[PDB]
């Protein structure tokens, strides 16, 4: 079973990765100014 797929999966995965990195990795919050790594460590 080899279903034919469109190239748009590239852009979809890129958008998903960009959203994930922007939300949960890089940008801290304004209520405490702490990264999720620092949060988990504390």
Residue 10 Cβ vs DNA, minimum distance, rounded to whole Å: 19
Among 1, 30, 37, 42, interactor with DNA by CB under 7 A: 37
Q: What are the phi and psi torsion angles at 36 (to 5°)? A: -60, -30
* The two three-digit tokens of residue 37, written as one number: 């790594």
* The two three-digit tokens of residue 6, written as one number: 């469109």
Of the two residues 30 and 37, which places its CB atom closer to DNA in the complex? 37
Of the two residues 29 and 36, which places its CB atom closer to DNA in the complex? 36
How many residues of this chain interact with DNA, rule: CB under 7 A? Answer: 5
Total Cβ atoms within 10 A of residue 38:
11
């Amino acid at each position: 079973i080899t279903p034919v797929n469109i190239e748009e999966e590239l852009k979809s995965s890129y958008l998903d990765y960009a959203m994930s990195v922007i939300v949960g990795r890089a940008l801290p919050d304004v209520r405490d100014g702490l990264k999720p790594v620092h949060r988990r460590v504390l």
